[PDB]
């Protein structure tokens, strides 16, 4: 009834998308071959959102895997769940100019033909989701081009991009501020939801709250894919208070230039303290409003929160959730704005994730990302023909709008 088209750009986007497909596949009970295995009919009531039924009950993802290098393509194909994908949806061929003007200018015809075919085969399409990073040449140059072309073709749709954001300490590329500054220009204009992911915040979450000694890139991607599934479980599973992507967008976008969001996953706990800690709604609220659970190198104590939403999974009451949100908004009164009453939004789904009684996913729109934008601007200006100046101008406009709405 409602469908989402998935696009995978860049190496990091490919890995995160593959982990997403694994997570939702074993949440929906799909064999890596393609057969269905599960006791619950609610796994098969809504399978046309992400999957297409082939002949004989085989299900194939509705994703397009696009890259300029065969190495990552072969890695995803030889990965654990790589054989489920469509063999025609693998389209393959560090500079933003290479990704947007010279080498990526010819593959996008073959990209958009397959994307248009998969959109035409859908009954009543709802939206797009694209996974990439802002610091890679391919993941920026091809990503912004695909966003621009899809927004030109389909005006009245919802689009969610999941972008891995540059970090100050863990950065491994030198053209990182250049690529970020060149990509925010297109991500501020033709985007309905941007989701910021920081690998430094991922490392700190793996270090402090979960106590990992050797965090693997797959373990970093699993935590992102859990939040990616949690933000969209309300389109696939029945709930007590349902809210789809457009219901999230209308509530959480006050002005068209403020749609960059910090996400969160809230039942996180290590093996040592699992018996010592009980899990219910109030301490789920405590963990999800905890600042160390945040997904970016931004500190919420510095700024102010415009709009916050929480999607819950599992069997729980609603009076507890309403009391929890009212109480936390009353205790933290200076941390929310005063010209918008009722900054909190609650959605509750009747289905918890794998191996857990309940779960909580946090999503936030706050002024704290203005520091994240300013640090990239300051890193770019020291290393820094007219489009660079225009990009710096629009970043300055964005942080000025954040400051004038914060104060």
């Amino acid at each position: 009834m409602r469908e989402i088209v998935h696009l995978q750009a860049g190496q990091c986007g490919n890995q995160i998308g593959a982990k997403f497909w694994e997570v939702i596949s074993d949440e929906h009970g799909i064999d890596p071959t393609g057969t269905y295995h599960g006791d619950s009919d609610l796994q098969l009531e809504r399978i046309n959102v992400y999957y297409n039924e082939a002949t004989g009950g085989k299900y194939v993802p509705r994703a397009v895997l696009v890259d300029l290098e065969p190495g990552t393509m072969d890695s995803v194909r030889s990965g654990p769940f790589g054989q489920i994908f469509r063999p025609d949806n693998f389209v393959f061929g560090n500079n933003w100019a290479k990704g947007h003007y010279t080498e990526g200018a010819e593959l996008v015809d073959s990209v958009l033909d397959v994307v248009r075919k998969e959109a035409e085969s859908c009954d009543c399409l709802q939206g797009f989701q694209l996974t990439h990073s802002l610091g890679g040449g391919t993941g920026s140059g091809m990503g912004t081009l695909l966003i621009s072309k899809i927004r030109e073709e389909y005006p009245d749709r919802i689009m969610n991009t999941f972008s891995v954001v540059p970090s100050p300490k863990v950065s491994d590329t030198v053209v990182e501020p250049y690529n970020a500054t060149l990509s925010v220009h297109q991500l501020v204009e033709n985007t309905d939801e941007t989701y910021c992911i920081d690998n430094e915040a991922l490392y700190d979450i793996c270090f402090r709250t979960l106590k990992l000694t050797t965090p693997t890139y797959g373990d970093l991607n699993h935590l992102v894919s859990a939040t990616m599934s949690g933000v969209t479980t309300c389109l696939r599973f029945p709930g007590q208070l349902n809210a789809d992507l457009r219901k999230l967008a209308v509530n959480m976008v006050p002005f068209p230039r403020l749609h960059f969001f910090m996400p969160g996953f809230a039942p996180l706990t290590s093996r040592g303290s699992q018996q010592y800690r009980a899990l219910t709604v109030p301490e789920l609220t405590q963990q999800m409003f905890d600042a160390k659970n945040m997904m970016a190198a931004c500190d919420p104590r510095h700024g102010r929160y415009l709009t916050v939403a929480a999607v819950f999974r599992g069997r729980m009451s609603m009076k507890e959730v309403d009391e929890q949100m009212l109480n936390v908004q009353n205790k933290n009164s200076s941390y929310f704005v005063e010209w918008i009453p009722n900054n909190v939004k609650t959605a509750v789904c009747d289905i918890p994730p794998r191996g857990l009684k309940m779960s909580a996913t946090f999503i936030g729109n706050s002024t704290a990302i203005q520091e994240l934008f300013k640090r990239i601007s300051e890193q770019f200006t020291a290393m820094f023909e007219m489009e660079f100046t225009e990009a710096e101008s629009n970043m300055n406009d964005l942080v000025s709008e954040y400051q004038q709405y914060q104060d």
Binding site: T35, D39, C206, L210, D219, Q240
Partner: protein, 272 residues
């Protein structure tokens, strides 16, 4: 040693998935290749099973699976074949049966089950299901891995809690028929025990109400000689045998509070 997925999904230490992605990919690749080869070569699933079972015992063994993969052009390690065999054998009886062969090594939905397949036992009567709801076509049951048992995991709150298919009363009644009426009523007493009857009865009274005889005197039980002298003074002259018959009928009409005046009059009216 545990990753982040085990921590997130609270998985048991026996079922940790760190360090097995390569072997899961290899099992999936060999599984899909065998399914593709089976569909391309054998048009009948029973024929494919009979080709795979060379010894004819109805079971598939590890050496038979080695020979089958050698025929199907796959070079497998012994560890890989043992792990794939353990994946295939859900029931842990050391043998691959028809059901999990058709569910893990072959496409069970592309080849529809036919009359000869039903006639040819390898399958149980519980192994046949309808293909889909409201359809005459029949297929095989889907064996489930122990990882994917989610029946108690997913349940809807609203509809399932609401699903209802269609202790003594607590409070005070308007008419206090449960409390027996006191012998003498206090002036402050106002509660209705039921003796205050109809407005018709108070307006136009019957002869008992005029002369003081009421429902309490009607329903009060009496003694044998008292009923005898009451009947004798009325003048309804009865012999002792029919008097005892009337007494027995009045006792049988209601065991508790027996032989009341209303019961005796009802018995007499029924007999007359």
């Amino acid at each position: 040693e545990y990753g982040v997925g085990d921590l997130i999904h609270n998985r048991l230490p026996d079922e940790y998935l760190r360090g097995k992605d390569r072997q899961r990919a290899l099992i999936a690749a060999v599984r899909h290749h065998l399914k593709k080869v089976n569909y391309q070569k054998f048009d009948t699933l029973l024929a494919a099973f009979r080709h795979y079972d060379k010894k004819g015992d109805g079971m598939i063994d590890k050496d038979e699976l080695q020979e089958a993969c050698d025929q199907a052009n796959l070079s497998l390690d012994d560890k890989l074949l043992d792990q794939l065999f353990d994946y295939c054998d859900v029931d842990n009886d050391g043998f691959i049966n028809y059901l999990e062969f058709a569910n893990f090594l072959n496409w069970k939905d592309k080849m529809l089950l036919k009359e000869y397949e039903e006639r040819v036992l390898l399958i149980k009567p519980e192994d046949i299901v309808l293909k889909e709801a409201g359809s005459t076509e029949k297929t095989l049951r889907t064996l489930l891995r122990p990882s994917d048992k989610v029946s108690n995991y997913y349940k809807t709150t609203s509809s399932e809690i609401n699903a209802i298919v269609g202790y003594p009363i607590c409070g005070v009644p308007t008419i206090r028929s449960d409390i027996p009426a006191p012998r003498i009523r206090r002036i402050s007493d106002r509660t209705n025990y039921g003796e205050e009857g109809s407005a018709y009865s108070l307006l136009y009274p019957t002869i008992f109400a005029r002369k003081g005889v009421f429902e309490r005197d009607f329903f009060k039980t009496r003694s044998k000689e008292e009923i005898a002298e009451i009947l004798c003074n009325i003048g309804v002259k009865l012999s002792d045998e029919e008097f005892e018959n009337v007494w027995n009928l009045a006792s049988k009409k209601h065991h508790r509070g027996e032989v009341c005046v209303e019961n005796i009059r009802n018995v007499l009216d029924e007999l007359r």
